Amino acid sequence: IAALVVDNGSGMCKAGFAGDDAPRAVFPSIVGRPRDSYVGDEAQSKRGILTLKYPIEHGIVTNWDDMEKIWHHTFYNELRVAPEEHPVLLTEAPLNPKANREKMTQIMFETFNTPAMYVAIQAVLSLYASGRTTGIVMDSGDGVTHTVPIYEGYALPHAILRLDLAGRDLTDYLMKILTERGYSFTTTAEREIVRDIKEKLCYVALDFEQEMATAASSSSLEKSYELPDGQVITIGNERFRCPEALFQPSFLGMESCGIHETTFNSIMKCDVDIRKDLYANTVLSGGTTMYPGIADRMQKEITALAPSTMKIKIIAPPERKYSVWIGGSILASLSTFQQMWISKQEYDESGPSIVHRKCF
Amino acid sequence: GDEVGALVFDIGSYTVRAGYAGEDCPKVDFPTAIGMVVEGPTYYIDTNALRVPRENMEAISPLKNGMVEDWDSFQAILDHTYKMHVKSEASLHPVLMSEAPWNTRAKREKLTELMFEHYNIPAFFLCKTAVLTAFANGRSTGLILDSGATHTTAIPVHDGYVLQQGIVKSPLAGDFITMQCRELFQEMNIELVPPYMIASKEAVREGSPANWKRKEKLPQVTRSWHNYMCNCVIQDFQASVLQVSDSTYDEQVAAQMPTVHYEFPNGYNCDFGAERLKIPEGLFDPSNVKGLSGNTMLGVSHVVTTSVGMCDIDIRPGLYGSVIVAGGNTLIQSFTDRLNRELSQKTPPSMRLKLIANNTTVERRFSSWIGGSILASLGTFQQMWISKQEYEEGGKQCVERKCP
Amino acid sequence: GLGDVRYRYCLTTLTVPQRCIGFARRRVGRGGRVLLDRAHSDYDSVFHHLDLE
Amino acid sequence: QERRWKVAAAKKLVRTVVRHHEEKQLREERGKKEEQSRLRRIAASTAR
Amino acid sequence: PLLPSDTGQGYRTVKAKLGSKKVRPWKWMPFTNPARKDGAMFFHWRRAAEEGKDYPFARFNKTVQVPVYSEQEYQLYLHDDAWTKAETDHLFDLSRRFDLRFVVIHDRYDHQQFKKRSVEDLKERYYHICAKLANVRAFDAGHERRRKEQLERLYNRTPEQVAEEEYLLQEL
Amino acid sequence: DQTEVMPLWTPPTPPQDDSDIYLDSVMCLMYEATPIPEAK
Amino acid sequence: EGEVTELTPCETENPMGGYGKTISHVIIGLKTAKGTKQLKLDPSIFESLQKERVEAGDVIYIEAN
């Protein structure tokens, strides 16, 4: 017997088994395609005859065959397990059309025929991992953004906010500015190298303007990084020019409310009676979202814009790159949730819609 | 799968709602209004465009007394919905919409034509909002009260059919509450310092002068847009202060409440007293409104009496079996309790009275959308579809033949 | 005496976790699933007397 | 009824998880306390 | 005041019984409803094998039933005296569409264009027309009108007066 | 309050033959007729 | 009556002197078909139940008084 946990990040799949602390296998979620279509890094290794593909576009599915095959290869190589003797837990972004839910339910049941299945939003599982009752979740995921005010382990779809800005667009902008600095970054290797440089030295400025003054005056901000070719890159203001775009969509030519502005909008969309508690129950999301000076700066910005009459107690788990998967393992490791699973015969007797009848 | 991937849409006096069929809640919502920057032109919809400051917005509400105003705006808003939220080709998906008690047949034909031809919808349907809400309560013959943002109307229903005669287009609504807040500000003399023009809201106490900083980067806005975002602020304040005296109002009784410490965008925060209860009592009777001798409006109990009397005798017990609420302005506290008190007083005990128990914001507002999804779910209704083939055949004129 | 045709409820207990369930009635649901709806009446809080005191 | 019921399900799940976190931490603490008590006891064995 | 739902899992104790039992597939198949004369093609999540079965749910085609006249009934059998052929036709059409909800018919009957007539006026007129047709081809307006005016009088009975009326009645 | 299994609520069924029925809201008087409403 | 679900002591070092490895009293989780519960059991009764073959998954006749 085994327990299966499947976390499908915006651009990287990270699966594991209930009770485990970390995913079994992890890798970017890309799909090869011959001009046999291979999976993720498997496809990447064969770039010559396989073309990169992202089934999780916008944080959303594209073609059922693509993730059919990602699961195929997952099971056959990474897990190398027989899930059809174990429950299958899956997660989704909020506001997903019922079409996708029924489609994935049917694909599971027919293609793989696993006994027990169940689905639940990523944000609520991450909150479960965070061990708190009522609050607001910021979904600074990897490909898309959302703001989920969860109450009593229960969320209101209307109150949620959406935005398809995440580490991929941040990396694209950082690549653009680095090229503007006098460098160049075109192919996949360059994209991943830019993401590497970001993950290494990029951080979140406190006072972006005095931060500019210091970067243009204090060269300490300007730092040296060995590129894969060995090239040393001076990186000063650009260490944090991109992250400030999060509060300023104008950085990329986009127009919208900043991240904390978005959060204030969301909390307003809730009921006032518990917005103080929500403030007390901030959240963070995304392994691509732990950059230094981020939690404190966001705390300051909320304290400013959010009325001080309420308590703004931030919550910044430094280990949130897997929050969703960790919460999923925790949930799958609960007694009262075992009953809640959904059997294959239940589908055979009710069809895919049973998921929308029970899977909540 | 006796349900097809249909989409239900609900647009009320205050905001715009919609969502899949058979679901618990409408998927999304956003302000009824749209910000216009005259130069196709620059349309500002949803918060990121509307509330966030820009230059030269002339916000426009394409609605009026539940009527279609700016057909181009409706088309643009539908496209905005589709792209920004749904991201689907409803041409592949049946759709339907509610309707007003009084929507012109001309405009209904216009929208039917537009839907079928442009939006390529596979099927359509229409029905009155109050009918949807009554369905939501699982009711066939009752009285609907809605304090939408625009009006405060009462409309009875029978066997799932509205009484055309029962329409009451009372003015009072969240607009009236905004006017009350404005007269309150006047009598106690606080201006409107909108948040957008405040860089920092510095520390300030009760009575303290408005201390704040402005962000220099603020291209000027229009009086329409700025006034309407101020109106949003005012409605937020009302919600923060919503309440009505449960009995005959008294100034000192209302003052006995501890003045609630409400803060403003500038950071200033004073404490408000009996005014929040002096104001609403007029809603239950406009005559008693001090200063404004409103008489054209019918007090709450007066509305009840009018609606009941204008019906016929036989079903009035049936209508009294149900009483329903709806609308953006229905957020008021002491709403239903004082409503029922005024009933028990003015409403004779001769006929048994019974209300509808629903007060959550979800129910209290989107009962109509809930009823719409409810109807969409039913397996028998499919014979009542409206195939696009039939529309192609008989123009948009099929509506009169198939819709009385 | 109120005369509600469909609101006819009754007491009973359950098989495995036997106990006074309170005024409840079975009812069909979506997907052809029966569901027990337990009511909430004048004696809701006192659903343990037994022996018809 | 479905509306009524899923809210209850969410509530019970929240209670379960909060309780789980609670015993996790209590077990951690009491394990530490027992460890130090055992160390004192072995030192008392030295004293024996 | 909640509702438990059926549970089939309970516990991880059901390893077997599935490998021998295939999950009968379901498909989002098209279909047509007979109740829609145009036969609009819609879709069902049928279990694949259940393909082509007539629409099982459209068997409820029960409707109201109203008679008709062409040239003589309105002048020979159902010979009208107060209505126009148009008024009889409009009444019967509202009946057919509204399935005999006379209050609905009247409230949706043109009183201005056609002769202004109370709901009971239309009721009695239809009674005459239909009974004439039935007997030739082979219902109490007055008493009910009296009873209804009595009802509305009693209803309007001022609440204090109703109070003393009931006080007497109980005092008996 | 011999002891009997409780009833159930179910969806409807196709009409083989008309079971036409309506329920008034008066719920006060006996629901057959009046014997002698007046000097008939 | 019931089925032995669990069994635990109420440890306490309060007793005078000595390594405080002492049990204030025992906690016994018992389950009948009606339900489950546990009761406070004095230290002496653990010796008794040792006497009997008390093991997880069996039932017992515990005279209250």
Give the contacts of B22 (CB within 8 A, at least 6 positions apart): A356, B3, B373, B376, B377
CATH tag for A123-164+258-323 (out of 3.30.420.40, 3.40.50.300, 3.40.630.10, 3.30.2010.10): 3.30.420.40
Helical H segments across B99-143, by residue range: 105-114, 129-136
- Residues with Cβ within 8 Å of residue E30, at least 6 apart in sequence: E41, E42, E43, E44
Please give the DSSP secondary-structure letter assigned to residue A50: B
Smallest Cα–Cα separation from B146: which of B366, B371, B376, B373? B366
What gap in Å lies between CA A65 and CA E27, rounded to an integer? Answer: 17
CA atoms within 13 A on the CB side of A176: 12
Cα C36 from Cα C28, distance rounded (Å): 9
Which chains are adjacent to chain C, needing at least 3 Cβ pairs under 8 Å?
A: A, E, F, G
Adjacency order of strands within the sheet including C24-29: C33-38, C24-29, F8-9
Q: What share of chain F is helix, strand, coil (3-state, %, to 5)?
A: 0, 5, 95
Alpha-carbon distances, residue E118 vs E66, E102, E111 (angstroms): 21, 10, 8
**Chain C residues lying within 8 Å of E5, measured CB to CB:** 29, 33, 35
Interface chains of chain D (3 or more CB pairs under 8 Å):
A, E, G
- Look at the domain A2-122+324-360 and name its fold: Nucleotidyltransferase; domain 5 (3.30.420)
**In contact, E13 and A345? CB cutoff 8 Å:** no
E33 contacts on B by Cβ (under 8 Å): 382-383, 385
Token pair, residue C30, equals 């979506």
Q: Does domain A165-256 fall into CATH 1.10.3720.10?
A: no
Burial of B139 (0-12, 13-18, 19+ CB in 10 A): buried
Query: Please, do chains F and A touch (3+ CB pairs < 8 Å)?
Result: no
**Tokens representing residue E24 in the block:** 């009968």
Q: Which residues in chain C touch residue A353, judged by CB atoms under 8 angstroms apart?
A: 30-31
Among candidate residues B192, B383, B175, B126, the one with its CA nearest the CA of residue B297: B175
Residue B374 has a CB neighbour count (10 Å cut-off) of: 18
Q: For residue A4, what are the contacts with CB-CB under 8 A and spacing of at least 6?
A: A15, A17, A18, A79, A81, A83, A86, A87, A88, A89, A114, A332
Rounded to whole angstroms, the Cα distance separating E97 from B176 reads 41
Q: What is the Cα B367 distance to its own chain's centre?
A: 12
CA angle A235/A237/A241 to nearest 5° reads: 110
Structural contact between residues E91 and E125, judged by C-beta atoms closer than 8 angstroms? yes
Say yes or no for a CB contact (<8 Å) between D11 and A154.
Answer: yes
Residue ranges of domains in chain A: 2-122+324-360, 123-164+258-323, 165-256
By the 8 A CB rule, do B101 and B164 touch? yes
Instruction: Read off the tokens for B249.
Output: 């109002």
Q: Residue F9 and residue C28: Cβ atoms within 8 Å?
A: yes
Q: Distance between CA atoms of A321 and A287, rounded to whole angstroms?
A: 4
Sign, CA dihedral B372-B376-B377-B382, equals positive
The backbone torsions φ and ψ at residue B375, rounded to the nearest 5 degrees and listed phi first, read: -60, -45
Q: Is C29 on the interface with E (CB under 8 A)?
A: yes
CA atoms within 13 A on the CB side of A185: 25
**CA–CA separation, B178 and B234 (whole Å):** 6
B276-282: long-range contacts, CB 8 A cutoff, minimum separation 24: B276/B241, B276/B242, B276/B243, B277/B243, B277/B244, B277/B245, B277/B249, B277/B253, B278/B249, B278/B251, B278/B254, B279/B177, B279/B180, B279/B184, B280/B243, B280/B244, B280/B245, B280/B332, B280/B334, B281/B244, B281/B245, B281/B249
Can you tell me the distance from the alpha carbon of B181 to that of C36, in angstroms, rounded to the nearest whole number?
A: 49
Q: Are A282 and A314 within 8 A, CB to CB?
A: yes
- For F27, the closest chain C residue by CA position comes to C3
B174: helix, coil or strand?
Answer: helix
Cα–Cα distance between C34 and F9 in angstroms, integer? 9
Task: Give F1→chain E minimum CA distance, Å.
Answer: 21
CA distance E70 to A220: 101
Q: How far is CA E109 from CA A33, B351, E38, E68, E123, in A?
A: 68, 29, 30, 18, 12
From the candidates D23, D34, D37, D39, which should be mutated to test the interface with G, based on the most G CB atoms within 10 A?
D37
Contact C48, C21 (CB under 8 A): no
B102 neighbors B66 (Cβ within 8 angstroms): yes
Whether E26 and A115 lie within 8 Å, measured CB to CB = no
Is residue C30 within 8 Å of A357, Cβ to Cβ? yes
D47 touching chain E per CB within 8 A: no
Resolution in A: 5.3
**Angle, to 10 degrees, between the axis of helix B361-377 and the axis of helix B129-136?**
100
Using CA atoms, how far apart are residues B177 and E135, in angstroms rounded to an integer? 64
Set of chain D residues whose Cβ sits within 8 Å of the Cβ of E7 = none
Separation between Cα atoms, residue B163 and residue B169, nearest integer Å = 14
How many Å is the Cα radius of gyration of chain F? 18
d(CA B195, CA B185): 17
Indicate the residue type of E148: K
Q: Do B141 and F26 touch (CB under 8 A)?
A: no
How many other C-beta atoms are found inside a 10 Å radius of the C-beta of residue A23?
A: 23
Domains A2-122+324-360 and A165-256 share a fold: no
Residue type present at position E51: E
- Count of all residues that appear for chain A in the document: 360
What CA–CA distance (Å, rounded) separates A329 from A123?
14
Instruction: Say yes or no for a CB contact (<8 Å) between E14 and A343.
Output: yes
Angle at CA F32, nearest 5°, toward F29 and F34?
75
With beta carbons under 8 A apart, name residues in chain E contacting B124.
none
Chains D+A touching (3+ CB pairs under 8 Å): yes
Q: Burial, A48: exposed, middle or buried (Cβ in 10 Å; 0-12, 13-18, 19+)?
A: exposed
Cα(A205)–Cα(A301) distance, integer angstroms: 12
3-state secondary structure of E8: coil
Show which subunits contact A, needing at least 3 CB pairs below 8 angstroms. B, C, D, E
Residue B20: burial class (beta carbons within 10 Å; 0-12, 13-18, 19+)? buried
Interface touch A158/B52, C-beta < 8 Å: no
On whether the CB atoms of residues A281 and A127 are closer than 8 A, the answer is no
For residue F12, which amino acid is it?
Answer: P
Of A334, A298, A333, A336, nearest to A315 by C-alpha is A298
CB-CB contact of A333 with A86 (8 Å): no
Q: Give me the phi and psi of E41, to 5 degrees please.
A: -85, 115
State the nearest Cα–Cα gap between A339 and chain E, in angstroms. Answer: 4
φ/ψ (deg, to 5) at B168:
-130, 110
Q: What is the DSSP string of C29-40?
A: EGGGEEEEEE--
Asked if E4 and C33 come within 8 Å (Cβ–Cβ), the reply is: no
* Positive or negative torsion for Cα B67, B73, B77, B79: positive
In chain E, residues with a C-beta closer than 8 Å to the C-beta of D5 are: 2-3, 5
Q: How many Å lie between the alpha carbon of E131 and the closest alpha carbon of chain B? A: 26
Q: How many CA atoms lie within 13 A of G46 on its CB side?
A: 16
CB A40 within 8 A of CB A70: yes
Which of B270, B152, B160, B157 has its CA nearest to residue B204?
B270
Q: What element of type H or E holds C25?
A: strand C24-29
Tell me if there are at least 3 CB pairs under 8 Å linking chains F and G. Answer: no
Q: Which residues of A touch C (CB under 8 A)?
A: 349-351, 353-354, 357
Using alpha carbons, list the distances in angstroms from residue B357 to B324, B325, B360, B363, C40: 8, 10, 10, 10, 14
Cβ neighbourhood burial of A198 (10 Å; 0-12, 13-18, 19+):
buried
Q: Which residues pair with E5 in a beta bridge?
A: C35
Show the tokens assigned to B81.
Answer: 């919905």
How far C12 CA sits from the closest chain F CA (Å)? 9
CA-only gyration radius of chain A, Å: 21
**Type of residue at B8:** V
- CA–CA separation, A243 vs A259, rounded Å? 11
Helix axes B71-80, B105-114, angle to 10 degrees: 40
CB contact burial B266-280 (16+ within 10 A = b; e otherwise): bbbbbebbbbbbbbb
Neighbours of B265 (CB within 10 A): 20
Tokens describing residue A187: 């192919």
CA distances from A62 to A48, A79, A103, A111, A165 (A): 23, 24, 12, 18, 18
Distances (CA, A) of B30 to A96, B50, B54, B130: 18, 10, 18, 21
The secondary element (H helix, E strand) that includes residue A13 is: strand A12-17
Whole-angstrom Cα distance, residue E23 to residue E27? Answer: 12
Cα(E121)–Cα(E127) distance, rounded to whole angstroms?
10
Three-state SS across E28-70? EEEEECCCCCCCCEEEEEECCCCCCCCCCCCCCCCCCCCCCCC
CA dist., res. B175 & res. B60, Å (int): 15
**Is residue E105 packed enough to be buried (19+ CB in 10 Å), middle (13-18) or exposed (0-12)?**
buried
User: From E21, which residue of chain A is nearest by alpha-carbon distance?
Assistant: A345
Contact predicate B199/B212, CB 8 Å? yes
∠ CA E24-E26-E31, rounded to 5°: 135
CA distance A256 to B52: 8
Is residue B217 within 8 A of residue B211, CB to CB? The reply is no
In single-letter form, the type of residue at position A191 comes to R
Distance CA E22, CA E15 (A): 14
**How many residues in total does chain E contain?**
172
What SS3 state is found at B328? Answer: helix
What tokens does A131 get?
């061990």
Residue B169, both tokens? 């287009």
Distance CA B22, CA B5 (A): 10
Nearest CA-CA partner of A129 in D24, E9, D8: D24
Contact A353, A102 (CB under 8 A): yes
Distance from CA of A344 to the nearest CA of E (A): 7
How many angstroms away from the CA of A279 is the closest CA of chain C? 36
B62's CB contacts (< 8 A; 6+ apart) are B34, B68, B69, B70, B73, B74, B77
- At residue E85, the 3 state secondary structure works out as helix
Dump the DSSP string for B233-249: HHHHHHHHH----SSS-
Query: Which of C7, C14, C30, C37 to substitute to test the interface with E, most E CBs within 10 Å?
Result: C37
With the CA atoms of A73, A74, A80 and A84 taken in that order, what torsion angle do they form, in degrees rounded to the nearest 10? -100
Element (H, E) at B67: strand B67-68
Record: contact E3-D1, CB cut-off 8 A = yes
List the single residue in B3, B52, B362 with the smallest CB-CB distance to A257.
B52
Q: Do A357 and C30 touch (CB under 8 A)?
A: yes
Quote the CA–CA distance of A225 and A243 in Å, as a whole number: 19
User: Which residue of chain E has the CA closest to D6?
Assistant: E2
Cα gap C38→C23, rounded to integer Å:
6
Question: Please, which chains are in contact with G (at least 3 CB pairs closer than 8 A)?
Answer: C, D
- CA D14/CA D32 separation, integer angstroms: 28
- Taking the Cβ of residue A335 and every Cβ of chain E, the question of whether any pair is shorter than 8 Å is answered with no
> Alpha carbon of A69 to those of A66, A75, A83: distances in Å?
5, 10, 15
* C30 CB within 8 Å of a chain A CB: yes
Q: Does C21 touch chain E (CB under 8 A)?
A: no
- Tell me how far apart the alpha carbons of residues A241 and E75 are, in angstroms, rounded to a whole number: 92
Separation CA B226–CA B233 (nearest Å): 11
From chain E, pick out residues whose CB is under 8 angstroms from the CB of F18.
62
Q: State how far residue G33 is from chain C, nearest Cα, in angstroms.
A: 8
Q: Which of E118, E112, E105, E116 is nearest to E145 (CA)?
A: E118
C-alpha torsion angle, residues B33, B38, B42, B48 (rounded to 10): -50
Distance CA E163, CA F13 (A): 48
Q: Classify A107 as helix, strand or coil.
A: helix
How wide is the angle at C-alpha B389 spanned by C-alphas B385 and B393, nearest 5°?
120
Integer CA distances (angstroms), B95 to B109, B116, F30, in order: 16, 10, 46
